[PDB]
Each structure stands twice: as structure tokens, then as C-alpha cells.
Amino acid sequence: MIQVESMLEVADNSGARRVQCIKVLGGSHRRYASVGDIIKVTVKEAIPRGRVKKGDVMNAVVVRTKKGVRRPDGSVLRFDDNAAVLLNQNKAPIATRIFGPVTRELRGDQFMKIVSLAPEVL
Amino acid sequence: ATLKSLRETKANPAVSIFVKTHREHPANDQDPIALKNQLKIVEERLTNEFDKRTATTILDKIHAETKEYNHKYNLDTLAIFASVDDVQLIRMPLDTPERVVISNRFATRDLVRDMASAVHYYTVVLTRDKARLIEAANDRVVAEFDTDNAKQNNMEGIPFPIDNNGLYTTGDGGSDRSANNENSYLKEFFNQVDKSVQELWGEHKMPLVIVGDVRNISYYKEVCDRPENIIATVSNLTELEDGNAQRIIDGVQDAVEGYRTSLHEAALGEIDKARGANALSTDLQDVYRAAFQGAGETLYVRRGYIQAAKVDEDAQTLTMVTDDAVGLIIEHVINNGGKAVFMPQEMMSADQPIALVTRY
Amino acid sequence: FLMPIEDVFSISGRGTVVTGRVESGIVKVGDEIEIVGIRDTQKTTCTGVEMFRKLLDEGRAGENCGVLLRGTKREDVQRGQVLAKPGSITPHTKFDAEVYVLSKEEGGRHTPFLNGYRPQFYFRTTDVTGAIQLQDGTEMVMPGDNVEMGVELIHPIAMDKGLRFAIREGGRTVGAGVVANVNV
RNA sequence: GUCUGAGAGGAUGAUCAGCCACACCGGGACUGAGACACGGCCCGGACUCCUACGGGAGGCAGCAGUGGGGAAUAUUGGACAAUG
RNA sequence: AAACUGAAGAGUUUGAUCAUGGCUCAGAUUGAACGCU
RNA sequence: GGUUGGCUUAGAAGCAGCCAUCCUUUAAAGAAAGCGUAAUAGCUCACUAGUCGAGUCGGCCUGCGCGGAAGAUGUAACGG
């Protein structure tokens, strides 16, 4: 459960280190983003001379949450941080390296490179 | 001296010399040298292709006229239109390339460009205490709409300058400060100001630029009778009550240039419409032929597209002589009632620098 | 063997890779090939044929193999030239063509093709400005007709007698042509 | 040592020879007469690659050579016949 | 026997002069580049 | 049919606009009342002949109607 004004760690190599959610997309009163959900963020702290600069507004996908993700057997899977991966203007990853694990909720078409670049997929 | 006389004057030879020129010093140090170089070019061209007597006569007539030129009061281009009889000396702001054209007619394409770039508009100045209205053409104030304007005589609304003498501003009224009706009162004041502006516009329709604080501009916007007539809103102009009319005009210039840029951006869509209807010609020879036989409706030129060509009039062919084939096409289109639009070099590609929307 | 060049890039340690649909013939590692078109002809040799990030045994006709070159600095090759067997196919600029002018029902123009017309010619993977030059007795070509015309392109393009090109103005087709003679 | 300079000085430390230090980056040692080891080991790191996704591989500042940077610097040669 | 052998100035401040004093040049050198050949 | 009347206009052809609106073959047909064309082209109309058979056409005036006619707690603008 990510909402506007939530800090997320950055789980790729796009130069940002911390982002803040400024919009949960996909619905007029939509409250929360879980893993696989696309959010609007501002990058709040980036590495020097990186691709992304501090203060930029862009798209991200949540790739892990502390609330957890439910599985069809009823199990929950939680993480120690909230982490996103930055996206293009067409909601495609701009990453060449993914840090930390991700879940199988990113299986599909538009996050397949996130899945294939993650060190491990839960 | 005007575009009309220059276009309607015929000579043989008629020489148009355009010299690049600067407004400030020490940049204007090269204007004498640039003029002298451009005159050497035309002297040798005339001596080559007409004769020594014609060359020396034309150059003497223009020398006698350019000897007075101060070169400290230069504009951004110095144009010289010379014949064997008369010599005209004009200083144009716009721009041009240093060039010599010799033909049966003067190269008036830059004057056509300047004329086609003109915008006439109203400037409605709003404050919380007053409204002004300025009639404007490009850089200059035409009129400021005072009691001495004599276009406010049959006004039924309040004439300009409209002072906000509302009840809440003086204190008779009803609903004292505790009601918090300031916004509603100011909204109605701007509504009456809009009534006056619309009354004055209904006789001399031309677009309006709204100048004032961001809150005033927005209050006006949600109250204006014809909000689709507004071309620009400037919220960073200073001294709106006591300021000069010319000062307001100078403030609105970024907005006016943005509006011109938007007009060209829109003409892009007209070209696409003509291309879909297959009534657009982009080949230089096809454009020349269509413009020559009066079939051209709107010419679009890349703003600097100058091509010299071996134009044949009777055979109606163009091959690549006339030093300004594009200028000749512009002249034909203007003569046959069409319009010319000079689009910027990033709206129009260098691949296709000319496009004639034909009448059929 | 011939293959138009669509994309050009360079791989470190490997060299310039030129991708493209192999039109005909065969190309394998070690084959000598010349880069014909736009610029001047230059010879070179093949060192690698690969596609989908895996090395291929040999690039055959139809397949989209991207062939690697030796010593070409990725600036002497550009989109439009053909990777060709040496000697075969010569870069020309003056060629005669049996051009059919499209009517207004297949797109086309409402005005005829007249001598001195300069449209774009698309041959395989590039467009080049041309100069239609009708012979004696013809001043314009009615939309819907077909006639033999001479073309003077602005830069050399590798062509052979029988290759089919398209003519265009403003991005819409104004005719289709087939080369019938190449002159120097 | 090299260049310059009458010299004294000034500048400099390619090629040849001596000494030192380094071996993708940080750290630890093993074996050995000798190494904390350029084409050895272990751990950690960044980068490139392979993978069946569980895991693995690598280090031209050796000689050629490629990309890149640059104003600019060479062959992906032969033989151990000679000295080692 | 020998290693013991080596040292140049000019232009430019002034109406002109001498001095001072900077700037510039003629020499040699190079892991050189570039231009023409 | 003269004929794209003349002028104008890039065009200007019955039909942007301006000035005429004439003659001919006629049973009749306008220098055209509309649509249409960039201008042409094209389709009509006026008008005439034929078919049909008995009433029909258009203005003016008066009476009573119709549309124009959207609001907030509930019909809610004959008290029912």
C-alpha cells in the first residue's frame, strides 16, 4: 500500500535513490498502489551526473512493498522496504540493472525486462 | 517609399541591394564597409550585363543618396531600391541576407514579409481599481481610448479609462466587510469592463490581449463575453495604472510573438489539409507555373528560401537568369490575389522550403 | 549477392555492423564485398554474420542478417548503399526508366509530369531527389500515362536494368518506375 | 643521461641501461629458496558475458589487433637459424 | 701524442638624443602534428 | 442560336460584383429563378407543346387556436 507522499527506494540504476509518490494512477479516487501499479513520482535525491535529476516528475512501478502481496493460496509476501523502478514517458523501464528481488506480479509484457533483470523473482 | 509604390514601379534595370546592418556600436562599424562591398557587387554586375554607362549612372544616383546615411541610426537592414531615374533608401527592422537583385522589378519580398507579419490588437489593462484599453499595431500604440478618442462617443457602457467606483470602494453600499463580497464585486467590475471592451470591439473587431495580475486576468476570463477572442494574457507587466501606453505595448511583445508563432503552427494544419486534398504543390517549377497562371491561393515559404533559376515566362518552365525565383513566385502569388506566409525554419523543413496551396 | 543497408552501428572489438534484408546471393565470413551507392565505391571483407545476438553461419536471401565489416569506420557507410559482390552493380546517377504516372484514383497527382520536375525517388531503402527529363516530342505526361524518361539523380545510387523504384512528392506516390537503361 | 648554452646555468627524464612501484578496484594469505605472485588462490566490489534463473566465467599497463579518446603514433607477419 | 677551441646582434617609445626598460626577431632542438609536395 | 452580352476579375462563361437586359428560330425559352464549378461542365426552374379531366391560384381583413415556453421540498400557472 503506497499512497501520495510515500517515499520509495529506487530499485534500479537510473541514478535516483529516493522518490516520493505524487500520484497513484488508474482511477479518479484511487488510494493505494501495490506491486505492479504505476505511480507518478518526484525524484527526491539522485546520484551526481546520473540519467535522472533531483526534482524530476516521472513514472514508476512499485516492485516491492512492506504491506506485502497476497498469493492465491492465501500466503502473504512482505519486504523490508518500499521500492519502485523508474519508467519512460511510455511506462517502459529505463533500467539496465535491477537491485533487490521483485515479485511475479510484474509478469506480463511491459515489466518483463524488470523481471529478467532482477537478481531473483518471488 | 512604400511597398505599394515599390511593387508598382517598373524600371530596366531595377536594382535591390540589401545590406546587413547593426543598431548599436561598435557593431555598426562594419555597416559602411558592408554597404560599400554590396555596392561594388552591383557596380560590377551592372557593368558586366548592361553597360558601363548604366552602371555608373545607377551607382552615382545611389551614391548621392547614401552619402547622407549616418550609420549610427541604422536599423537591422538597409535596403536600396535603385533605377536610372529614382533611388529609394529604406531602413527595415526585420532581417534579410546581404544580396543584390537586378531585374525588371524591385525585390519587395522582405516588405511583403513585414506586411504579412503585422498584428493589430487591443490591450485590456486590468487592475483592482481601474481598466485601460489600448489599440495597438505591432510595436506601437495606435490609440489609448481616452475621452479624446472620439470612438467612445456613442458608448452605452462606461468609457475608458474605467475607474472602479463601486460601492465597496467608497463606502456607501451594503454588506460591509464582514460579508466578504470583494471577489463578487471585483468579478462584476471586470464584467462591466468586458462589456465596454466588447462594445468597442463590435465596431472594429480584432483580437485582445489581457494584461494584469494573474487573479485579475482569471476573474476576467471567467466573465468575458467572447473568451475565444483572447489571444494572450500577460501577468508580469509593471506600473499598470500610471504606466505609458507604449510601455504596456512593449510589455506585451513576448506574447504577441508567441501568437505569431502559433499562427504559423496552425498554418501547418492548412498545409496538411491541402496535401490530403491533393491541392498542394511543393516542386519549385510546379509552384511557379501555378502561381503564374493565377491558380495559387496560399504560398508558404521557409523564411530565407532564396533560389536563382532560369525562369522562362512564355514557355512557362523553371530550371536551375533570375536571382530570386522564390521572390518572383511571391510576386506572382500576391499579384493574382493570393496570400504569402513566411514560416520559421523549424516549422518548415529544409527538404521542402516552399509549398503552394493552389486554388483548384 | 546484394543487400541494401538499413542500419549502421559499431560493436567494440568486432567492427561496423550493417543490418539489412539480404536481397539475393549469399554472404559468409571472409567474403569480399563492396559498399556501393551514395558515396564512392569502397571494397572490404566480411568478418561476422549475426542476428538476434547470435552468430549465423551465412546470411542468405530474404533473411535480415546484419553483416560485420573489416576496417570500415562506420562513417564510410550510410543508410541507402548496398553491400554487394565486387564488380557486380555500378553506382549510377543517369538512368532511363519506364515510368507509369499514377492517376487520381490510386493517389497520384491531378497535374502532369512535366520536364524539369524534381521529385524524390525511392529505390530500396533511401530517397534521392531526381530530375525528370522527357525526350523530344513530350512536354508533359498526363496522369495515367506511361512513358520512358531520363532521370539525373543528385547523388549516385547503385542500380541495375530491371530494378523497380517509386516516385514521390510530399510523401504520396506520384508514379512507379522500372529502370530500363543506365547511362554514364 | 637528453636538449640548450662559451661556460656557469636553464629545461627535461621517449627509445638504451640501473633502481623503484604497479598488474580491473580493496583486502587476506597459501605454496615456495624466492611472491603477499601480470597470463595463481580466497573474500569483497564495480563492469562485461553465459544460464535450464538454481547458479557460473573473466581481466591485453605481454605481442599483434578492435572500439574509444585524440592534432597524432604501425602487422591480428616469420623463426627459434643466432644470443639467451 | 690527444681528449684542453670558446662568447655577434637587430627592430620598436623621441622632432631629434643619450639612458632605462619591456615586447619582438634572427639559432639550435623534437617520440611531434598539420599544409603542399 | 448570336453568346463566354459588355465591364471587372486570378476566374467572371445565365447564376461574386457593376452596367445593359437586345435580337433571332419559334409553340416556347430569362443576357436567367435556384443548386453546382476555381472558372467550365452538369442538374433543375421560369416558359411552351402533349397527357389528364373540373374547378383552381394567390394576396388582404376578422374570430378562435399552434410553436416560441427552462429552476430549484411535492402535482403545484382551473381551489380540487
CSV table of N, CA, C and O (backbone and C1' of nucleotides) in Angstrom, one decimal, chain A residues 13 97 99 116 118-121, chain D residues 46-49 51 53-55:
chain,number,residue,atom,x,y,z
A,13,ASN,N,19.1,1.3,-11.6
A,13,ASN,CA,20.3,2.1,-11.8
A,13,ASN,C,20.1,3.4,-12.6
A,13,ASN,O,21.0,3.9,-13.2
A,97,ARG,N,20.0,-2.3,-14.8
A,97,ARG,CA,20.3,-3.2,-13.6
A,97,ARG,C,19.2,-3.0,-12.6
A,97,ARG,O,18.8,-1.9,-12.3
A,99,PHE,N,18.0,-3.9,-8.7
A,99,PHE,CA,18.5,-4.2,-7.4
A,99,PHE,C,17.5,-4.8,-6.5
A,99,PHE,O,16.3,-4.3,-6.4
A,116,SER,N,13.3,-10.0,-15.9
A,116,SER,CA,14.5,-10.7,-16.4
A,116,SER,C,15.8,-10.1,-15.8
A,116,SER,O,16.8,-10.7,-15.8
A,118,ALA,N,16.0,-8.6,-12.6
A,118,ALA,CA,16.0,-8.8,-11.2
A,118,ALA,C,16.9,-9.9,-10.8
A,118,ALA,O,16.9,-11.0,-11.4
A,119,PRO,N,17.7,-9.8,-9.7
A,119,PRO,CA,18.5,-10.9,-9.2
A,119,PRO,C,17.7,-12.1,-8.8
A,119,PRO,O,18.3,-13.2,-8.8
A,120,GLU,N,16.4,-11.9,-8.5
A,120,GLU,CA,15.6,-13.0,-8.0
A,120,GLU,C,14.2,-12.5,-8.1
A,120,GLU,O,13.9,-11.4,-7.8
A,121,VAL,N,13.3,-13.4,-8.5
A,121,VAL,CA,11.8,-13.1,-8.6
A,121,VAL,C,11.1,-14.0,-7.7
A,121,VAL,O,11.1,-15.2,-7.8
D,46,A,P,28.7,-4.0,-6.6
D,46,A,O5',29.1,-3.3,-7.9
D,46,A,C5',29.3,-1.9,-8.0
D,46,A,C4',30.2,-1.5,-9.1
D,46,A,C3',29.9,-2.0,-10.5
D,46,A,O3',28.9,-1.3,-11.1
D,46,A,C1',32.2,-2.4,-10.0
D,47,C,P,27.8,-2.1,-12.0
D,47,C,O5',28.5,-2.4,-13.4
D,47,C,C5',29.2,-1.4,-14.1
D,47,C,C4',30.2,-2.0,-15.1
D,47,C,C3',29.6,-3.1,-16.0
D,47,C,O3',28.9,-2.6,-17.1
D,47,C,C1',31.7,-3.7,-15.1
D,48,U,P,27.8,-3.5,-17.8
D,48,U,O5',28.6,-4.7,-18.5
D,48,U,C5',29.3,-4.4,-19.7
D,48,U,C4',30.0,-5.6,-20.3
D,48,U,C3',29.1,-6.8,-20.5
D,48,U,O3',28.3,-6.8,-21.6
D,48,U,C1',31.1,-7.4,-19.4
D,49,C,P,26.9,-7.6,-21.6
D,49,C,O5',27.4,-9.2,-21.7
D,49,C,C5',28.1,-9.7,-22.7
D,49,C,C4',28.6,-11.1,-22.4
D,49,C,C3',27.6,-12.2,-22.1
D,49,C,O3',27.0,-12.7,-23.3
D,49,C,C1',29.3,-12.2,-20.5
D,51,U,P,23.0,-18.3,-22.9
D,51,U,O5',22.6,-19.0,-21.5
D,51,U,C5',22.8,-20.3,-21.2
D,51,U,C4',22.4,-20.7,-19.8
D,51,U,C3',21.0,-20.3,-19.4
D,51,U,O3',20.1,-21.2,-19.9
D,51,U,C1',22.4,-19.7,-17.7
D,53,C,P,15.2,-22.7,-14.7
D,53,C,O5',16.0,-21.5,-13.9
D,53,C,C5',16.4,-21.7,-12.5
D,53,C,C4',16.8,-20.4,-11.9
D,53,C,C3',15.6,-19.4,-11.7
D,53,C,O3',15.9,-18.6,-10.6
D,53,C,C1',17.3,-18.5,-13.1
D,54,G,P,15.1,-18.9,-9.2
D,54,G,O5',16.1,-19.7,-8.3
D,54,G,C5',17.5,-19.5,-8.4
D,54,G,C4',18.2,-20.7,-8.0
D,54,G,C3',19.7,-20.6,-7.8
D,54,G,O3',20.1,-20.1,-6.5
D,54,G,C1',19.2,-22.5,-9.1
D,55,G,P,21.4,-19.3,-6.2
D,55,G,O5',22.5,-20.4,-6.3
D,55,G,C5',23.8,-20.1,-6.8
D,55,G,C4',24.1,-21.0,-8.0
D,55,G,C3',25.5,-20.8,-8.6
D,55,G,O3',26.5,-21.5,-7.8
D,55,G,C1',24.0,-20.7,-10.3
